[PDB]
Amino acid sequence: ASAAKGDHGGTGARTWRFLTFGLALPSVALCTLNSWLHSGHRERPAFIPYHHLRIRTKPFSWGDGNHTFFHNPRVNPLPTGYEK
Amino acid sequence: MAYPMQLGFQDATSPIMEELLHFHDHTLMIVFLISSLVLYIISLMLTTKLTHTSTMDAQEVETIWTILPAIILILIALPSLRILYMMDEINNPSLTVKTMGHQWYWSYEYTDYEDLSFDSYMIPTSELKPGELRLLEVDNRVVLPMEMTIRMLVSSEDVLHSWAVPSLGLKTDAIPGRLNQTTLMSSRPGLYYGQCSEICGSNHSFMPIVLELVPLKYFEKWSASML
Amino acid sequence: FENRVAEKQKLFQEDNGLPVHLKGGATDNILYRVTMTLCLGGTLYSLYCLGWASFPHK
Amino acid sequence: HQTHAYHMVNPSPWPLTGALSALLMTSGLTMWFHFNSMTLLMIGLTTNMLTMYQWWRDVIRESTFQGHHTPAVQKGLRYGMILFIISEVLFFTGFFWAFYHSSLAPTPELGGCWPPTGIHPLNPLEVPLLNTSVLLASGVSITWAHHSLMEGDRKHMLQALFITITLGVYFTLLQASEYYEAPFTISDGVYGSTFFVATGFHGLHVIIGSTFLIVCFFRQLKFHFTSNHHFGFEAAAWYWHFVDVVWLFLYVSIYWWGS
Amino acid sequence: HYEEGPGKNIPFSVENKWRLLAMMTLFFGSGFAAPFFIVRHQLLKK
Amino acid sequence: ASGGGVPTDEEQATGLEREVMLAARKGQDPYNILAPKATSGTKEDPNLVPSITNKRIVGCICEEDNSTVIWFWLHKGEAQRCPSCGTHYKLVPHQLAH
Amino acid sequence: KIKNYQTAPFDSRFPNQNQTRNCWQNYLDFHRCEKAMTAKGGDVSVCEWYRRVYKSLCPISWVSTWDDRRAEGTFPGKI
Amino acid sequence: ITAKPAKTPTSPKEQAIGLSVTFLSFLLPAGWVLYHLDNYKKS
Amino acid sequence: MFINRWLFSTNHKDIGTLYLLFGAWAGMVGTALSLLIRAELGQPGTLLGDDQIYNVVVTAHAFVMIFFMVMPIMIGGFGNWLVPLMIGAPDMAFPRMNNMSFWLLPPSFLLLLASSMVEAGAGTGWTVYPPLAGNLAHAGASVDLTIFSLHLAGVSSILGAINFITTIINMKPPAMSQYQTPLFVWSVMITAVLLLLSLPVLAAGITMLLTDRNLNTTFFDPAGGGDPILYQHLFWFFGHPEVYILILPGFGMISHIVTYYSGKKEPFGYMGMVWAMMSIGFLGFIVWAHHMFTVGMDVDTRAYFTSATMIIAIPTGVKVFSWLATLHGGNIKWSPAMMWALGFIFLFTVGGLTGIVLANSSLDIVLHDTYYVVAHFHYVLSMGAVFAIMGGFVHWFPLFSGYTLNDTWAKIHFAIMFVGVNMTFFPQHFLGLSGMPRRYSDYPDAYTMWNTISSMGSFISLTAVMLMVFIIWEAFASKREVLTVDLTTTNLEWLNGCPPPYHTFEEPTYVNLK
Numbered sequence A: 001a002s003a004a005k006g007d008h009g010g011t012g013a014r015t016w017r018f019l020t021f022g023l024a025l026p027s028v029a030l031c032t033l034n035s036w037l038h039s040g041h042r043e044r045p046a047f048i049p050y051h052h053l054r055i056r057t058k059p060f061s062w063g064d065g066n067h068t069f070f071h072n073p074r075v076n077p078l079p080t081g082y083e084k
Numbered sequence B: 001m002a003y004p005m006q007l008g009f010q011d012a013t014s015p016i017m018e019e020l021l022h023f024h025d026h027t028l029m030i031v032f033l034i035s036s037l038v039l040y041i042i043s044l045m046l047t048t049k050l051t052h053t054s055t056m057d058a059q060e061v062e063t064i065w066t067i068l069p070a071i072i073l074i075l076i077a078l079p080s081l082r083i084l085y086m087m088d089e090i091n092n093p094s095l096t097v098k099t100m101g102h103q104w105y106w107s108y109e110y111t112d113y114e115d116l117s118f119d120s121y122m123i124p125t126s127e128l129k130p131g132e133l134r135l136l137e138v139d140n141r142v143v144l145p146m147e148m149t150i151r152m153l154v155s156s157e158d159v160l161h162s163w164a165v166p167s168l169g170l171k172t173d174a175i176p177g178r179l180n181q182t183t184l185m186s187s188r189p190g191l192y193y194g195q196c197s198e199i200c201g202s203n204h205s206f207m208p209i210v211l212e213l214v215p216l217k218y219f220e221k222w223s224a225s226m227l
Numbered sequence C: 001f002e003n004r005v006a007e008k009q010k011l012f013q014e015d016n017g018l019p020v021h022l023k024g025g026a027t028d029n030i031l032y033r034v035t036m037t038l039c040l041g042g043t044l045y046s047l048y049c050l051g052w053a054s055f056p057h058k
Numbered sequence D: 001h002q003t004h005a006y007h008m009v010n011p012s013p014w015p016l017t018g019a020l021s022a023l024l025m026t027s028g029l030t031m032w033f034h035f036n037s038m039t040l041l042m043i044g045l046t047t048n049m050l051t052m053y054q055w056w057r058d059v060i061r062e063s064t065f066q067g068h069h070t071p072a073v074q075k076g077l078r079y080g081m082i083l084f085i086i087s088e089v090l091f092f093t094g095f096f097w098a099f100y101h102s103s104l105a106p107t108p109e110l111g112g113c114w115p116p117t118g119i120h121p122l123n124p125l126e127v128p129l130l131n132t133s134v135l136l137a138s139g140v141s142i143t144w145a146h147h148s149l150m151e152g153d154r155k156h157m158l159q160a161l162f163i164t165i166t167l168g169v170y171f172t173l174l175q176a177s178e179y180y181e182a183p184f185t186i187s188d189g190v191y192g193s194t195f196f197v198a199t200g201f202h203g204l205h206v207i208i209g210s211t212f213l214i215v216c217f218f219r220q221l222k223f224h225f226t227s228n229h230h231f232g233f234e235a236a237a238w239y240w241h242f243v244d245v246v247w248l249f250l251y252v253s254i255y256w257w258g259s
Numbered sequence E: 001h002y003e004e005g006p007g008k009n010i011p012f013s014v015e016n017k018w019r020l021l022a023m024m025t026l027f028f029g030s031g032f033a034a035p036f037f038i039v040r041h042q043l044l045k046k
Numbered sequence F: 001a002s003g004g005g006v007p008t009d010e011e012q013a014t015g016l017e018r019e020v021m022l023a024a025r026k027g028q029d030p031y032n033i034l035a036p037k038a039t040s041g042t043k044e045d046p047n048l049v050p051s052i053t054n055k056r057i058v059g060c061i062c063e064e065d066n067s068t069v070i071w072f073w074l075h076k077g078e079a080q081r082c083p084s085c086g087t088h089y090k091l092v093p094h095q096l097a098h
Numbered sequence G: 001k002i003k004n005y006q007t008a009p010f011d012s013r014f015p016n017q018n019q020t021r022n023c024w025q026n027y028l029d030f031h032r033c034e035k036a037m038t039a040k041g042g043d044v045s046v047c048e049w050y051r052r053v054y055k056s057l058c059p060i061s062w063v064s065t066w067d068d069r070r071a072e073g074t075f076p077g078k079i
Numbered sequence H: 001i002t003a004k005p006a007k008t009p010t011s012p013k014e015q016a017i018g019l020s021v022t023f024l025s026f027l028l029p030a031g032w033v034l035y036h037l038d039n040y041k042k043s
Numbered sequence I: 001m002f003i004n005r006w007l008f009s010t011n012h013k014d015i016g017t018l019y020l021l022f023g024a025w026a027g028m029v030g031t032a033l034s035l036l037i038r039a040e041l042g043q044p045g046t047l048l049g050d051d052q053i054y055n056v057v058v059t060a061h062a063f064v065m066i067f068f069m070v071m072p073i074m075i076g077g078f079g080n081w082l083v084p085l086m087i088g089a090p091d092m093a094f095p096r097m098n099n100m101s102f103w104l105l106p107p108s109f110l111l112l113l114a115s116s117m118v119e120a121g122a123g124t125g126w127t128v129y130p131p132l133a134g135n136l137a138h139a140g141a142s143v144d145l146t147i148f149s150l151h152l153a154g155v156s157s158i159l160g161a162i163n164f165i166t167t168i169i170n171m172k173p174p175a176m177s178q179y180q181t182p183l184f185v186w187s188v189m190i191t192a193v194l195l196l197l198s199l200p201v202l203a204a205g206i207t208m209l210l211t212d213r214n215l216n217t218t219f220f221d222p223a224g225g226g227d228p229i230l231y232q233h234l235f236w237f238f239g240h241p242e243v244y245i246l247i248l249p250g251f252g253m254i255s256h257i258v259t260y261y262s263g264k265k266e267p268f269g270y271m272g273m274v275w276a277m278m279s280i281g282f283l284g285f286i287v288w289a290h291h292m293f294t295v296g297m298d299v300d301t302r303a304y305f306t307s308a309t310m311i312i313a314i315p316t317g318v319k320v321f322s323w324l325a326t327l328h329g330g331n332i333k334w335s336p337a338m339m340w341a342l343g344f345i346f347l348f349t350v351g352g353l354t355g356i357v358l359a360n361s362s363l364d365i366v367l368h369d370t371y372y373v374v375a376h377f378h379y380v381l382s383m384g385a386v387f388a389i390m391g392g393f394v395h396w397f398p399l400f401s402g403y404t405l406n407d408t409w410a411k412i413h414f415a416i417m418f419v420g421v422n423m424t425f426f427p428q429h430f431l432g433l434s435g436m437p438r439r440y441s442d443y444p445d446a447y448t449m450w451n452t453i454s455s456m457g458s459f460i461s462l463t464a465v466m467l468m469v470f471i472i473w474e475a476f477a478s479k480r481e482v483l484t485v486d487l488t489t490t491n492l493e494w495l496n497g498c499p500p501p502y503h504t505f506e507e508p509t510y511v512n513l514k
């Protein structure tokens, strides 16, 4: 590809700043817009004591040895299901 | 099994292991020849007062000793591959037996028709009957029909193990969660031994494999009685 | 801010036969001692811990 | 007394303190994992931090202040970083090998399908897409920063560098949130395994790279970089790109193709 | 500056051949001995 | 859109790199960075090997594209010859640091 | 009826040493064919084939375990 | 290679000492543990 | 002043010396372990106990001999000593990081010894395969410490690899091209590259094994969708390169030694030797599955690996013949080092030929996991790598110490070790073919004869190793200082006298571009 713009006669600082503020950052603006739109807490699915998930071969070296590191009560069930 | 003061391979019981033997024989010849050649030449370079320490040209003789070993590897790969394709060959079995490794014994399962299964342990040195082999005997042998194409499926229920039967040329790893296929076919009746071939813990040296190759008929009776 | 690199070049080239990790002044010394102390102390402690774990507590 | 361009380094304690802090960290981890105690780990981390701090403070001293970084010495440092990066790549390749192995031949315990039964992937068109744009953006802003430095524009180099840093931080924060909001955990089988480990390590490098950039920022602040001699910045930039590219591979492999 | 020349470029002293024999003895011996005492140690836990 | 505030090599280079930069501006090679071009290596036109003591090691690549390099100490005094091809080398001692 | 089964024959869909899928496949095929016949009013005699095959190949413990799971309601496969 | 005569010649007698001392540093600690092997297995 | 020189060093010579000391000590440990092994198999029945303690020994034997003896000596030792000098460099590119590469090994070793101290040790085989290495069949700290030990050994060697490459690339005399550097320098670089590429992988693998064991991941656990076989791929991906990494520097030293004592100014076919070493290094990255012929892979795959592995014989064959050609027409100096080299040439060929035998996945089925494999690798390691280390050591000892060794005592040490190792490993070819499996504490009665002979050879080798220590002391006790050394014109490392000064090549060599 060649993109859809042009410059190249000389790729110097002014050019790269131009890209930063007129493409890069706006990209991140849209993606932030989009992201903070399709967000919203999606209905946590029904718990099923599946034997291939919520694995426990050794207690975790923190807490009560049964909660994952970034454990989220709202969406991370314990081997025995969701919390109170 | 192996005898005292053995040099080569345990005698070939299957046609496949008969194949490997003949292949190992032409291969080993080359191994001898080359290793002895080197040795001779080493001696040849070391047995003379004559000298020539000035520069010696290389691009002319490198064609000789590149192309030569080259042609040799090919004289080892060719029979090696045809034989490899042989072991994979489609054959259509009469029976199917599964074996599962466990720390530290082999369990067997013949479930084509009946739901026959049994554990197989090594007979301790202390309970061996007169004339029985130390470390090699099991309480429950794997009875099988001589002169019949059989399908063995190997797996394990804990750590890794490996099912081996030297005389027939067999070794397949017993991997938990996996089902490894390999075909068996004895050209003769009798007792055939092997040992666990993959470190599996404390008693890895003590969990052999014995196969009893009898004719179809007795095999059937035995199946039935084993119920 | 102002460019003070020249002051620093002078200080660090000041021929006092000091090794670069201490040539910055008295602070360097302190930091180094803390570091070295921790390392060695921690090392002993670890040796202690290997010892403790080497024997069963049934 | 010497007639060559190379650098003869003053004997230093850091290699030792470093080798030692490694010993304390590995031990500290064993202590924690098995005998529930962070004490060792604590010290190990602390000495590691001090070692790195002092060891790199000295390298700044030897170059900006003492002028030991002749072109030959700088040329050598370039090969050094490129080589380091390569190994880092191969390291990640390990995790990619793993993920590819697991997702191309899913086992019966997952349900012989990918993703496994019971796994609900994050939407690749949501935060993951955003992270993707953030790192790409930092790649641009860091390039503006570079071309500003090479043109001797201090104010703009600082501006560009600052933004670049703010983006890396933002990625880190977004990722932290995503780690939390994630319905799956590291304990959720091979998916959760290959996921959090790979992205977990990448996240770490993001933090390292950000740290490095932060350092380059302050050194810029104190005028250490000349429009022509600024290898410390050159490296942080190369590293940052490596990080940027790894993320591209992750996004495509794990978040996109693997959902 | 550091001492240069034979017997000066090493961390152990070679002044006295006997003190040295002892030195080398403790060194090489301690290493060889180690596995044995570990084996011993493992047999003595159970 | 533009400005300054970033030191240049000329203004900030210090230590050995400065010396190299300066000596490099004068077309000199004090810190042996370039590969010296060979004379005809004859008795009359030997290869002038700079130095800062009474000897220096010479590496003689007799013919272009030779893989073996002949090494020997070049002593102050009478011009010596490469044990291999016999080209002549003459030491031309001291100075560098004024 | 069209049987006289000795042992599961060669399946061109699983020609390598790894047979894990072969077993797994046939175990799924049966319980699926079985649920269709029990549902729509028909005879499970048609799903005989798979039952024999999976039985021949699958380790008792695998079968035992997968069955314990379809009951517990935690079978990962789609049936 | 050419070398200067020994600055501190090691006479045969001295060597025998060296050799012996050497072998003993290897052989003794091991020989010990190896000897009390049985005393170890069941103790 | 002692600390500054030995704990804070930045001198390539000192650091290589430190490596040489570490390597020697570790060699003692590894030899001890090797004897405990052969003792158990000495006569039938059990000596130490079951397979757990036995295998904790076999595992450490490997780790120590490899990571703590052969690599530190060849690379950190002869590497840091010889490389700079061979290219006229003042030191290494990052002489300070080079120190850290060294100071990682003791902690690395410490962790290894610590794993055999706690719990029951890690009786997992040096390959540490799961699930036997998992937190269930091997619960406890043991395996976790072995891992960390590998990590430290890993970081060390990776950094070491960077230094050697940067150095060999950037720090040569302006006129010297890569095709003008000595073979040993080449070999060191190539090796440094394999390390760079292979090690990070091993690091990723064992790290997955660590998490599976402490973080509930299941990379190699079927219960979670994992696969034990994955670890194998990751491991051997590094594992094969590693074997080549253990022999290349040896190839380097051999080329110098054979040339030197052949009375030659140069090794036969230089470019050929460079090609060869690079080919090998290359092919050593696409043949790892030759270690997995029995885990049952597609026949096409096993066909490929059989083919690929066998090709390595061609470049390797070149080297051997070149070595013979270097001897060709030389004025042979039957010194010790020459003897080790001649020893190496032959023995190594044998271990390589058998390596080729194992290449056939057909034949490997029956030979895999037997003693035939042990025979092959001990022939190229305990005879290949080891012989090269010996030769290099006797040869350059004068240069490192300033003293000379008693040549006759040296020729005696050679004769003993020669008999020892052969008697030790040759009979294992029989045991392998006749079916004796690996990692067995006891064996069926028919295997009694050969196992007894083997254990006996291992004892002669013990006698030999003790002698060596003595010979070393002897040279250090007598103090025969070095005067003259022949062939310096083509052995630049010797040109600054024995031992050269702390600071060498402060003033760069003079080389004409022409």
Ligand SMILES: CCCCCCCCCCCCCCCCCC(=O)OCC(COC(=O)CCCCCCCCCCCCCCCCC)OC(=O)CCCCCCCCCCCCCCCCC
Residues within 6 Å of the ligand: B007, B008, B009, B028, B031, B032, B035, B036, B039, I350, I354, I422, I423, I426, I427, I429, I430, I433, I453
């Ligand atoms: C230590 C115990 C020895 C036991 C000996 C045999 C007893 C036979 C009884 C009674 C003998 C007759 C009745 C039985 C016939 C069985 C035939 C069989 O089943 O056949 C297959 C068997 C037996 O093969 C044989 O047919 C035996 C071959 C022996 C070759 C020995 C070379 C020995 C050199 C020095 C002595 C050994 C130590 C040093 C070895 C150094 C490396 C070779 O298994 C092998 O494949 C073993 C070898 C594996 C591969 C090693 C390859 C390179 C070896 C040597 C190259 C040297 C070249 C220069 C020439 C040699 C120069 C030194």
Ligand code: HEA
Residues within 6 Å of the ligand: I020, I023, I024, I025, I026, I027, I028, I031, I034, I035, I037, I038, I058, I059, I061, I062, I063, I065, I066, I069, I070, I073, I124, I125, I126, I127, I374, I378, I381, I382, I383, I385, I386, I389, I390, I393, I421, I424, I437, I438, I439, I440, I441, I458, I461, I462, I465
């Ligand atoms: C290169 C490394 C190396 C070396 C040299 C050796 C040397 C020895 N090893 Fe082995 N060995 C391994 C690496 C090595 N080995 C590995 C990787 C395994 C497989 C592990 C596994 O399966 O998990 C193995 C396995 C192994 C087994 C099989 C165990 C089993 O299957 O149960 C046996 C048994 O015979 C054995 C024997 C020996 C013997 C008798 C020696 C003797 O020959 C040793 C004689 C002593 C020396 C040759 C030491 C010399 C070097 C020095 C001491 C440096 C000295 C100082 C200076 C010069 C500076 N080794």
Ligand code: HEA
Residues within 6 Å of the ligand: B030, B034, B038, B068, B069, B070, B072, B073, I126, I127, I243, I244, I246, I247, I290, I291, I309, I310, I312, I313, I314, I316, I317, I318, I320, I348, I349, I351, I352, I353, I354, I355, I356, I357, I358, I359, I360, I364, I367, I368, I369, I373, I376, I377, I380, I381, I384, I385
């Ligand atoms: C020093 C390290 C070293 C070296 C360099 C080699 C070299 C080779 N090795 Fe390996 N090998 C090991 C160390 C080494 N090996 C180890 C440690 C193991 C066991 C690992 C473990 O399980 O822990 C092993 C295992 C191993 C296996 C796995 C077997 C099994 O576990 O079942 C195989 C597979 O093919 C093999 C083959 C080879 C081959 C083909 C070579 C080739 O590179 C050899 C090439 C050399 C030559 C061919 C000789 C010279 C050639 C000529 C004179 C020309 C003519 C040749 C012909 C025409 C035939 N080796």
Ligand SMILES: CCCCC/C=C\C/C=C\C/C=C\C/C=C\CCCC(=O)O[C@H](COC(=O)CCCCCCCCCCCCCCCCC)COP(=O)(O)OCCN
Residues within 6 Å of the ligand: A068, A069, A070, A071, A072, A076, D172, D175, D176, D179, D180, D181, D182, D183, D184, D185, D186, D187, D196, D197, D199, D200, D201, D203, D204, I151, I154, I155, I203, I207, I210, I215
């Ligand atoms: C915010 C994004 C950045 C990620 C890193 C930041 C914080 C975590 C701390 C250290 C992480 C560094 C590397 C990654 C190592 C393991 C993967 C961790 C990735 C991560 O953080 O994954 C988390 C698991 O945390 C866990 O167990 C982690 C448990 C923490 C202990 C770390 C274990 C240390 C093991 C390190 C091994 C070192 C070997 C490396 C060697 C390198 C080469 C030699 C996921 O949380 P979860 O609740 O399961 O699912 C979330 C559900 N809401």
Ligand SMILES: CCCCC/C=C\C/C=C\C/C=C\C/C=C\CCCC(=O)O[C@H](COC(=O)CCCCCCCCCCCCCCCCC)COP(=O)(O)OCCN
Residues within 6 Å of the ligand: D075, D078, D079, D082, D083, D085, D089, D092, D093, D096, D238, D241, D242, D243, D245, D246, D249, I165, I193, I282
């Ligand atoms: C599915 C997998 C998923 C995982 C993937 C994850 C990530 C993707 C991979 C990569 C992307 C990451 C970052 C890229 C950004 C910057 C990297 C830096 C490159 C750079 O900017 O390089 C410059 C120039 O090119 C140079 O180095 C050229 C010189 C290079 C020298 C170093 C190499 C030496 C090492 C060994 C040599 C190899 C030999 C080749 C022949 C072998 C044949 C078989 C700097 O100059 P210098 O060193 O002084 O050289 C002087 C030559 N001009």
Ligand SMILES: CCCCC/C=C/C/C=C\CCCCCCCC(=O)O[C@H](COC(=O)CCCCCCCCCCCCCCC)COP(=O)(O)OCC[N+](C)(C)C
Residues within 6 Å of the ligand: B041, B055, B056, B057, B058, B061, B064, B065, B068, B069, I321, I322, I324, I325, I328
């Ligand atoms: C799978 C296993 C493979 C098996 C290997 C087979 C080995 C090959 C066997 C024979 C090779 C024949 C090479 C012929 C070269 C001629 C030898 C000679 O004589 O050597 C020189 C040639 O230079 C030159 O090629 C340089 C000197 C000689 C060049 C070749 C010598 C090296 C040969 C190898 C050494 C033995 C190692 C063999 C390896 C297995 C002499 O030079 P000239 O006569 O011009 O000058 C002298 C002055 N006059 C004119 C007055 C006489």
Ligand SMILES: CCCCCC/C=C\CCCCCCCCCC(=O)O[C@H](COC(=O)CCCCCCCCCCCCCCC)COP(=O)(O)OC[C@@H](O)CO
Residues within 6 Å of the ligand: D093, D097, D100, D101, D102, D104, D105, G016, G018, G020, G021, I298
């Ligand atoms: C690279 C350029 C050279 C080109 C030559 C080709 C070599 C490698 C690339 C090919 C990778 C894709 C091929 C996949 C197609 C098959 C899909 C599959 O299914 O393969 C799977 C594994 O693939 C997997 O993870 C494969 C995982 C990757 C393994 C390859 C290792 C090389 C990596 C290191 C190189 C460093 C590069 C640096 C990066 C910039 C599983 O194995 P199967 O045996 O099927 O098990 C199923 C059984 O139930 C039935 O028998």
Ligand SMILES: CCCCCC/C=C\CCCCCCCCCC(=O)O[C@H](COC(=O)CCCCCCCCCCCCCCC)COP(=O)(O)OC[C@@H](O)CO
Residues within 6 Å of the ligand: D056, D057, D059, D060, D063, D064, D069, D077, D207, D208, D209, D211, D212, D215, D224, D225, D226, D229, D230, D231, D232, D233, D235, F012, F013
């Ligand atoms: C919470 C955070 C803690 C996490 C732990 C790690 C923390 C931070 C790591 C960030 C790295 C900081 C590195 C800063 C280096 C500063 C020294 C520097 O940048 O030194 C420069 C040389 O580059 C040099 O050595 C280049 C030096 C290379 C260093 C880069 C290495 C990255 C480290 C990664 C470690 C982990 C590996 C992955 C784990 C699996 C100096 O040369 P110049 O700039 O040209 O100056 C001279 C001019 O002024 C002349 O006019």
Ligand SMILES: CCCCCC/C=C\CCCCCCCCCC(=O)O[C@H](COC(=O)CCCCCCCCCCCCCCC)COP(=O)(O)OC[C@@H](O)CO
Residues within 6 Å of the ligand: D007, D009, D018, D019, D021, D022, D025, D026, D048, D051, D052, D055, D059, D062, D063, D073, D077, D080, D081, D084, D087, D088, D091, I093, I094, I095, I096, I097, I098, I148, I151, I152, I155, I158, I200, I203
């Ligand atoms: C389970 C936990 C395991 C933990 C293991 C931890 C191991 C060690 C921890 C402590 C180490 C950190 C201390 C700082 C090290 C900095 C080295 C550095 O920055 O080294 C530089 C060279 O490498 C360069 O540039 C480029 C290369 C930069 C290398 C940075 C070192 C980071 C160490 C981690 C490497 C991980 C391997 C990655 C692959 C998995 C400088 O070379 P020196 O000889 O110093 O100087 C030469 C002079 O001319 C400088 O003026």
Ligand SMILES: CCCCCCCCCCO[C@@H]1OC(CO)[C@@H](O[C@H]2O[C@@H](CO)[C@@H](O)[C@H](O)[C@@H]2O)[C@@H](O)[C@H]1O
Residues within 6 Å of the ligand: H027, H028, H029, H030, H031, H032, H034, H035, I035
């Ligand atoms: C594989 C490496 C090992 C190689 C083989 C070892 C070579 C010989 C070592 C000699 O060592 C010893 O010999 C003893 C027997 O001769 C012991 O003495 C012991 O035995 C006694 C005498 O029979 C007693 O006097 C004491 O109590 C004592 O424990 C014992 O201490 C030990 O040091």
Ligand SMILES: CCCCCCCCCCO[C@H]1O[C@H](CO)[C@@H](O[C@H]2O[C@@H](CO)[C@@H](O)[C@H](O)[C@@H]2O)[C@@H](O)[C@H]1O
Residues within 6 Å of the ligand: A061, A062, A063, A064, D025, D032, D038
């Ligand atoms: C190669 C580079 C990588 C090197 C290794 C990475 C090091 C990672 C450090 C992790 O350490 C931690 O461990 C803990 C566990 O001890 C934590 O506390 C926690 O754990 C508990 C102790 O049981 C509880 O009291 C608390 O709720 C709390 O969350 C926690 O905050 C965190 O700092």
Ligand SMILES: C[C@H](CCC(=O)O)[C@H]1CC[C@@H]2[C@H]3[C@H](O)C[C@@H]4C[C@@H](O)CC[C@]4(C)[C@@H]3C[C@@H](O)[C@@]21C
Residues within 6 Å of the ligand: C001, C002, D154, D155, D158, D159, D162
């Ligand atoms: C003071 C300095 C000007 C040059 C000098 O030091 O004399 C100015 C110019 C540009 C820099 C800034 C850039 O304009 C970018 C940043 C923008 C601000 O919103 C916050 C701080 C910010 C991170 C910077 C802080 C500021 O103090 C800097 C460092």
Ligand SMILES: C[C@H](CCC(=O)O)[C@H]1CC[C@H]2[C@@H]3[C@H](O)C[C@@H]4C[C@H](O)CC[C@]4(C)[C@H]3C[C@H](O)[C@]12C
Residues within 6 Å of the ligand: B059, B060, B062, B063, B064, B066, I271, I272, I275
């Ligand atoms: C062309 C290259 C370098 C020559 C030089 O610049 O001196 C040389 C070095 C090694 C040679 C290779 C080795 O001799 C090995 C092979 C030998 C066969 O004679 C031809 C191809 C063969 C693969 C060679 C081709 C070529 O002549 C090579 C590759």
Ligand code: CUA
Residues within 6 Å of the ligand: B101, B160, B161, B162, B196, B197, B198, B199, B200, B201, B203, B204, B205, B207
């Ligand atoms: Cu089963 Cu070992």
Ligand SMILES: [Cu+2]
Residues within 6 Å of the ligand: I239, I240, I243, I287, I288, I290, I291
């Ligand atoms: Cu290999």
Ligand SMILES: [Mg+2]
Residues within 6 Å of the ligand: B162, B197, B198, I368, I369
């Ligand atoms: Mg195996």
